[PDB]
From Swiss-Prot, chain A:
PTM comment: Tyrosine phosphorylated.
Known role: Microtubule inner protein (MIP) part of the dynein-decorated doublet microtubules (DMTs) in cilia and flagellar axoneme. Plays a key role in the assembly or attachment of the inner dynein arm to microtubules in sperm flagella and tracheal cilia. Forms filamentous polymers in the walls of ciliary and flagellar microtubules.
Tissue specificity remark: Expressed in trachea multiciliated cells.
Protein name: Tektin-2
Subcellular location: Cytoplasm, Cytoskeleton, Cilium axoneme; Cytoplasm, Cytoskeleton, Flagellum axoneme; Cytoplasm, Cytoskeleton, Microtubule organizing center
Subunit structure as annotated in this protein's UniProt entry: Microtubule inner protein component of sperm flagellar doublet microtubules. May interact with CCDC172.
Native source organism of the sequence: Bos taurus
Family indicated by similarity: Belongs to the tektin family.
UniProtKB/Swiss-Prot annotation, chain C:
Shown chain mapped onto the complete sequence: 53 to 156 of 208
Origin species: Bos taurus (Bovine)
Record key words, sorted: Cell projection, Cilium, Cytoplasm, Cytoskeleton, Flagellum
UniProt note on tissues of expression: Expressed in trachea multiciliated cells.
Origin superkingdom: Eukaryota
Protein name: Tektin bundle-interacting protein 1
Quaternary structure and interacting proteins, as annotated: Microtubule inner protein component of sperm flagellar doublet microtubules.
GO BP annotation list: flagellated sperm motility
Purpose: Microtubule inner protein (MIP) part of the dynein-decorated doublet microtubules (DMTs) in cilia axoneme, which is required for motile cilia beating. Located at the center of the tektin bundle where may function to recruit tektins or stabilize the bundle.
Gene Ontology annotations for the cellular component aspect, listed alphabetically: axonemal A tubule inner sheath; axonemal microtubule; sperm flagellum
Swiss-Prot record, chain F:
Span of the signal peptide: none
Organism: Bos taurus
Top-rank taxon, per record: Eukaryota
Segments passing through the bilayer: none
Purpose: Microtubule inner protein (MIP) part of the dynein-decorated doublet microtubules (DMTs) in cilia and flagellar axoneme. Forms filamentous polymers in the walls of ciliary and flagellar microtubules. Contributes to normal sperm motility.
Protein name: Tektin-4
Family: Belongs to the tektin family.
Protein localization: Cytoplasm, Cytoskeleton, Cilium axoneme; Cytoplasm, Cytoskeleton, Flagellum axoneme
Gene name as annotated: TEKT4
Record note on quaternary structure: Microtubule inner protein component of sperm flagellar doublet microtubules.
Curated annotation (Swiss-Prot), chain H:
Subunit structure: Microtubule inner protein component of sperm flagellar doublet microtubules. Interacts with TEKT1, TEKT2, TEKT4 and TEKT5. Interacts with CCDC38.
Intrachain disulfide bonds: none
Upper lineage: Eukaryota, Metazoa, Chordata, Craniata, Vertebrata
Function: Microtubule inner protein (MIP) part of the dynein-decorated doublet microtubules (DMTs) in cilia and flagellar axoneme. Forms filamentous polymers in the walls of ciliary and flagellar microtubules. Required for normal sperm mobility.
Organism: Bos taurus
Tissue: Expressed in spermatozoa where it localizes to the sperm head (at protein level). Detected at lower levels in the sperm flagellum (at protein level). Expressed in trachea multiciliated cells.
Domain of life, source organism: Eukaryota
Gene of this entry: TEKT3
Official protein name in the record: Tektin-3
Included stretch of the parent chain: 295 to 343 of 490
Changes after translation: N- and O-glycosylated. May be proteolytically processed during the epididymal transit of spermatozoa.
Entry's family note: Belongs to the tektin family.
Localisation per UniProt entry: Cytoplasm, Cytoskeleton, Cilium axoneme; Cytoplasm, Cytoskeleton, Flagellum axoneme; Cytoplasmic vesicle, Secretory vesicle, Acrosome outer membrane
Length: 134, 66, 104, 50, 54, 50, 99, 49, 49, 49
């Protein structure tokens, strides 16, 4: 019963992190469309260039977070994939150990929502830039 | 493909009483056929990607001149 | 025995033809019955593991050869077996190239 | 299917007649010949599709 | 997992509870095995005396 | 000590795949089991003549 | 190099994870006596037994695993030194051309 | 072989060993009966003489 | 006494593998920071292009 | 799961082997008792003759 319940909790965390990954994929492709449209009326102009710089660095920060979500889904799918009678199972040297990068659920998802909110912020400010230049 | 098919041959050295056919034989032959099929489809799609990049290079050659 | 005493004796095996499957009406056991516990438990776990494979891979584990000789099954394989159609688009400058005309 | 049924039926014999006679030799030759022929047919169908 | 992703989820509490239950489970099973072998020793210790007096 | 030696041999036989070894304890326990059997046989012969 | 470090790590972790069970086995065999209980007649073991190693072969297997572990750790430090030199070269070569 | 045939082969071996143990147990009980009957018969004839 | 000497040798090799595993953990954990520095350099060289 | 089934069958075999060895040395003991009793029965024949 405890092994079945551990499988249920692990699948629940998988279903959370995949949702975060796909919604950041949506934000990434919207940023790609935004940088291309802002370039296509770049071809005031100094302000356009400096918000291009801000938009590029925001894109790279969400790209780093997206790569982190990719590898996290790979680790959790593999951990549910492994089961009884495989060679990888072993007694561990220290199972119970809290490593250096200890953070909590609330701080983790407020950080992810925080950089999404920054992304949406410069998208919107770029929209009134788009309409002012046009 | 390495690991699965040498798993098959390294299994099949067995003596007379345990020379049998369990589910492991059937799952392993299904494994090696489907991995072979994955090889052929990825090879074909790599070939079509090469052809697409040929068309890209040809359009570059005719567009940088003009 | 190997002696001057010698007898030709037939003997019948246990779960073959002499035992039955469990139920609540036949519940506890009769001690006289040839209930072969080792084969019963092994065949129980074998059936638990056996129910996962589909039916052609079950009838390959039978004695007589009623199985299809070609290993990939019809209902599992997405591709047609020995189908001749394969859409190859010739690269010509101009019109649009495309992929996967089998599944549009 | 016919050949494997003959194999199990003739193998279910009793003790003073469980003999490796010429019938079992020919049944084994039948099983080998059938499997070789149908695998050759499989490869020929592949080439004719190609 | 890397630096931002060590999240400390429900799974870590569930796994430490399972391990912490499990040493007690295996300890109780070893204790009952020792008790059973002690019982078998006592039954031999009286079976010898009955077999002699018969 | 027959019981002690047999149970030690059994618990040593339940060892993992590489630590299962042709050990000094294994040779001593084999010699111990053989010596205890021969001593028990001699004791039974003395009982019969008694 | 990170994944190769991990897979030699778990391989030497296998070779360590045998030791806890084998150590507990030998300690449980150490605590028998004659007055103590729980010793019994298991007469298969004297007649028939299986063998997989000698003490020197067992030790040699452990040296082989630990040697490959230390090689895979040191190759990482070599690549780290290359990383240091390459990034200093990159920063210098970009700054000089920009100036 | 098929795994059911393999498992039935090893249980046939185990049932043959169990049958032979049963035959030996009945033989040893009848040895003890032959010993006690033989001793009683000889001593009764001795005391009649 | 044979059981005791085998136990001592096994204890020594177990502790040695414990030390090697801990050192490899620390080496990989310090190698990851070079990848972090590498990615930061990639960002701040993606800007100047 | 295949090698787990093999291990279960091995355990069944070694159980029956232990019981089998117990049977065969009990029957050798009863046989030597029968031989000693046979010689002891042989001597009163000489007495009666």
């Amino acid at each position: 019963w405890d092994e079945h319940d551990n499988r249920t909790r692990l699948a629940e965390r998988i279903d959370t992190v995949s949702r975060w990954k796909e919604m950041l994929d949506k934000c990434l492709t919207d940023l790609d469309a935004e940088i291309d449209a802002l370039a296509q009326m770049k071809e005031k102009i100094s302000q356009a260039f400096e918000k291009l710089f801000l938009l590029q660095e925001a894109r790279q920060r969400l790209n780093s977070d997206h790569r982190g979500k990719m590898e996290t889904l790979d680790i959790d799918r593999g951990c549910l994939s492994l089961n009884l009678t495989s060679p990888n199972i072993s007694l561990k040297i220290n199972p119970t150990r809290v490593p250096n990068g200890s953070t909590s659920l609330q701080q983790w998802d407020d950080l992810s929502r925080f950089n999404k909110d920054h992304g949406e912020a410069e998208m919107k400010k770029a929209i009134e830039l788009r309409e002012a230049i046009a | 493909l390495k690991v699965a098919q040498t798993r098959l041959d390294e299994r099949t050295r067995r003596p007379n009483i345990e020379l049998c056919r369990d589910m492991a034989q059937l799952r392993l032959v299904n494994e090696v056929y489907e991995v072979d099929d994955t090889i052929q489809t990825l090879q074909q799609r790599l070939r079509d990607a090469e052809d697409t990049l040929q068309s890209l290079a040809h359009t570059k050659a005719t567009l940088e001149h003009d | 025995p190997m002696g001057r005493d010698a007898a030709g004796q037939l003997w019948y095996t246990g779960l073959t033809n002499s035992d039955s499957r469990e139920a609540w009406y036949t519940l506890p056991r009769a001690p006289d019955s040839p209930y072969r516990e080792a084969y019963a438990r092994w065949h129980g776990c074998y059936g638990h593991r056996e129910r996962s494979l589909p039916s052609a891979y079950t009838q390959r584990l039978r004695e007589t050869a009623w199985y299809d000789p070609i290993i990939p099954a019809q209902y599992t394989d997405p591709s047609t077996r020995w189908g001749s159609v394969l859409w190859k688009d010739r690269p010509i400058r101009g019109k649009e190239f495309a992929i996967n005309r089998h599944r549009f | 299917s016919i050949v494997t049924d003959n194999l199990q039926c003739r193998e279910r014999r009793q003790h003073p007649d469980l003999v490796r006679d010429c019938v079992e030799i020919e049944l084994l030759k039948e099983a080998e010949l059938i499997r070789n022929i149908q695998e050759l047919l499989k490869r020929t169908i592949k080439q004719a599709v190609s | 997992r890397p630096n931002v992703e060590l999240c400390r989820d429900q799974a870590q509490y569930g796994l430490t509870d399972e391990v912490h239950q499990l040493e007690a489970t295996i300890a109780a099973l070893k204790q009952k095995l020792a008790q059973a072998q002690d019982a078998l020793d006592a039954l031999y210790k009286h079976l010898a005396r009955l077999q002699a007096d018969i | 000590p027959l019981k002690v030696a047999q149970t030690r041999l059994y618990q040593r036989s339940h060892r993992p795949n590489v630590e299962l070894c042709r050990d000094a304890a294994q040779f001593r326990l084999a010699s111990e089991v053989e010596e205890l059997n021969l001593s028990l046989a001699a004791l039974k012969e003395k009982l019969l003549e008694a | 190099q990170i994944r190769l470090n991990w897979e030699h790590k778990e391989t030497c972790e296998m070779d360590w994870s045998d030791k806890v069970e084998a150590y507990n086995i030998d300690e449980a065999c150490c605590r028998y006596n004659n007055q103590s209980t729980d010793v019994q007649f298991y007469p298969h073991s004297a007649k028939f037994e299986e063998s997989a190693s000698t003490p020197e072969t067992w030790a040699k297997f452990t040296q082989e695993h630990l040697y490959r572990a230390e090689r895979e750790r040191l190759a990482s430090v070599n690549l780290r030194n290359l990383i240091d030199c390459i990034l200093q070269d990159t920063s210098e070569d970009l700054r000089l051309q920009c100036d | 072989s098929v795994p059911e045939s393999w498992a039935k082969f090893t249980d046939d071996n185990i049932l043959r060993s169990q049958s032979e143990r049963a035959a030996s147990a009945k033989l040893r009980d009848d040895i003890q009966n032959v010993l006690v009957v033989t001793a009683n018969e000889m001593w009764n004839q001795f005391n009649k003489v | 006494r044979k059981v005791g000497e085998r136990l001592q040798d096994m204890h020594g090799w177990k502790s040695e593998l414990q030390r090697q595993v801990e050192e490899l953990v620390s080496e990989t954990e310090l190698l990851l920071a070079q990848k972090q520095r590498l990615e930061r350099a990639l960002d701040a060289t993606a800007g100047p292009f | 799961e295949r090698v787990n089934d093999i291990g279960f069958w091995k355990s069944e075999i070694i159980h029956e082997l232990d019981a089998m060895i117990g049977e065969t040395n009990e029957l050798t003991d009863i046989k030597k008792r029968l031989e000693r009793a046979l010689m002891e029965t042989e001597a009163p024949l000489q007495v009666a003759r």
